[PDB]
Amino acid sequence: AHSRASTKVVVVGGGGTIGSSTALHLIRSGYTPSNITVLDVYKTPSLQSAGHDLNKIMGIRLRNGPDLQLSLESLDMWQNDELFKPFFHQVGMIDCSSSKEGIENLRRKYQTLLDAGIGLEKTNVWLESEDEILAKAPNFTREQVKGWKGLFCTDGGWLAAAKAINAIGIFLQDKGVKFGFGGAGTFQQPLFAADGKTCIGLETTDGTKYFADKVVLAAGAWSPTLVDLEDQCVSKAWVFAHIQLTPKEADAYKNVPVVYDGEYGFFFEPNEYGVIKVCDEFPGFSRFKLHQPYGAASPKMISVPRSHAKHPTDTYPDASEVTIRKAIARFLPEFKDKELFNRTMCWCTDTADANLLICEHPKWKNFILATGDSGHSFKLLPNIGKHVVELLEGSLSQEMAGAWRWRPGGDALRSRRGAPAKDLAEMPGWKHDAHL
Numbered sequence: 093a094h095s096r097a098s099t100k101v102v103v104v105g106g107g108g109t110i111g112s113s114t115a116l117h118l119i120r121s122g123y124t125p126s127n128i129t130v131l132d133v134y135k136t137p138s139l140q141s142a143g144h145d146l147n148k149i150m151g152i153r154l155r156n157g158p159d160l161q162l163s164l165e166s167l168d169m170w171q172n173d174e175l176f177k178p179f180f181h182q183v184g185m186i187d188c189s190s191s192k193e194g195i196e197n198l199r200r201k202y203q204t205l206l207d208a209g210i211g212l213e214k215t216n217v218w219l220e221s222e223d224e225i226l227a228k229a230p231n232f233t234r235e236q237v238k239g240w241k242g243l244f245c246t247d248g249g250w251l252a253a254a255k256a257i258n259a260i261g262i263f264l265q266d267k268g269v270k271f272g273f274g275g276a277g278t279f280q281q282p283l284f285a286a287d288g289k290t291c292i293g294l295e296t297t298d299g300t301k302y303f304a305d306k307v308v309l310a311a312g313a314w315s316p317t318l319v320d321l322e323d324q325c326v327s328k329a330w331v332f333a334h335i336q337l338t339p340k341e342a343d344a345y346k347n348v349p350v351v352y353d354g355e356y357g358f359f360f361e362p363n364e365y366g367v368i369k370v371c372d373e374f375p376g377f378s379r380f381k382l383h384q385p386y387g388a389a390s391p392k393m394i395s396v397p398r399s400h401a402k403h404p405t406d407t408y409p410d411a412s413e414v415t416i417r418k419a420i421a422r423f424l425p426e427f428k429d430k431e432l433f434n435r436t437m438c439w440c441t442d443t444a445d446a447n448l449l450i451c452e453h454p455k456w457k458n459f460i461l462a463t464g465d466s467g468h469s470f471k472l473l474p475n476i477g478k479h480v481v482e483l484l485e486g487s488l489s490q491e492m493a494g495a496w497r498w499r500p501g502g503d504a505l506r507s508r509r510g511a512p513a514k515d516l517a518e519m520p521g522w523k524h525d526a527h528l
């Protein structure tokens with residue numbers, strides 16, 4: 093515990109999901125706005141954030157105990173918090189499959205919700221027939237959904253990810269939070285007291301020093317490139333592309349639920365401009381490089397994001413074009429011949445157990461790690477920062493702290509993905525620098 097009036101906190105990655113949430117909650121908790129500094133490479137929402145997207149799925153996670161609480165806190169805020177409400181489109185979500193194994197997995201998912209005995213059945217509906225699926229998704233045809241079975245999350249939908257992070261940044265700026273970007277916002281190293289162990293701020297790549305009582309490293313997929321996380325977090329890329337619908341087609345897809353099949357991927361209702369985003373589903377791609385983060389004695393093998401923001405001409409691997417097109421054929425057969433654009437790789441960071449890594453650095457007192465999003469944490473935007481502030485103040489619940497603790501040793505490359513990510517170096521087609 094410490095004064096909220098006199099304590100300075102610097103948040104690194106303030107343009108991102110966990111960083112923005114943290115900044116927001118320092119301000120809501122009553123920290124002096126001018127004592128809060130938010131740093132990022134790019135002005136918020138950072139072009140580089142995994143959160144800078146037309147959309148992310150809003151759904152429920154149950155694996156661990158924290159999952160359930162986090163998921164319910166999240167939903168409550170997206171539904172009722174004035175700041176967040178406009179960016180949650182509660183169109184529901186259909187999780188479907190037509191394979192023997194995929195359907196059994198869905199029945200398992202449903203059983204799981206039911207087994208919790210907190211009334212999840214009232215917002216999660218089993219869809220056993222074509223009729224029930226067609227009712228949730230009128231764009232589908234009966235022939236198309238032959239043998240499909242479904243779980244419908246009536247509570248679910250999608251999140252206007254970039255807009256929501258932007259709204260936080262506006263709020264913070266208004267309150268008088270300090271910001272640093274580019275050279276003045278790019279983390280280089282922590283600064284230490286004379287003991288070499290107590291963190292007292294951080295220095296950026298342009299040499300600017302920021303002194304503060306607590307530092308929060310919420311740099312997302314770049315976090316393990318900035319400090320040695322001992323393989324707890326492996327950054328991986330997922331992929332998406334866009335297709336343009338005509339005004340007529342776009343009208344038809346208005347308010348369609350998010351549609352997801354673990355064997356294919358998912359798509360979202362068109363944005364205001366008639367554009368649908370399609371994603372596949374796969375274990376992600378790594379991009380290992382020899383890299384020496386601050387504090388490391390020798391260079392390490394770290395998956396270093398290949399950022400679309402830095403490399404506008406990058407697309408994604410040829411293997412992704414195949415799987416994206418398979419998703420389109422499955423979900424949007426009438427659009428098979430639409431041309432794709434904005435082919436993009438977007439980066440997240442996996443831990444071995446898919447839980448967050450939110451904890452004080454084991455050696456550097458006052459330096460908090462807040463990462464390990466594991467590719468399903470955008471929905472935690474509204475609430476995750478509350479628990480980061482709790483950690484900062486020493487009041488984080490023991491079960492939550494334990495789940496998120498420093499815990500080197502697992503296999504983050506495989507995580508809970510069913511397979512280790514393949515490396516971009518082995519997956520041709522994404523790099524186009526070489527017309528230059």
Ligand SMILES: Cc1cc2nc3c(=O)[nH]c(=O)nc-3n(C[C@H](O)[C@H](O)[C@H](O)COP(=O)(O)OP(=O)(O)OC[C@H]3O[C@@H](n4cnc5c(N)ncnc54)[C@H](O)[C@@H]3O)c2cc1C
Pocket residue numbers: 104105106107108109110111131132133134138140141142143144147148149150277278279280310311312313314315318329330331332371438439440462463464465466467468469470471472
């Ligand atoms: C294709 C794809 C689809 C996804 N779909 C969903 C979904 O449907 N539902 C869901 O809940 N989640 C989804 N996710 C995951 C979600 O986007 C992430 O879990 C979440 O955005 C992670 O937030 P973060 O704070 O950990 O990182 P980020 O949001 O990426 O923010 C990290 C910030 O750190 C900054 N940074 C990097 N280096 C430095 C530095 N040196 N100094 C200062 N700042 C730095 C970056 O610019 C960035 O702004 C998806 C992810 C991907 C890739």
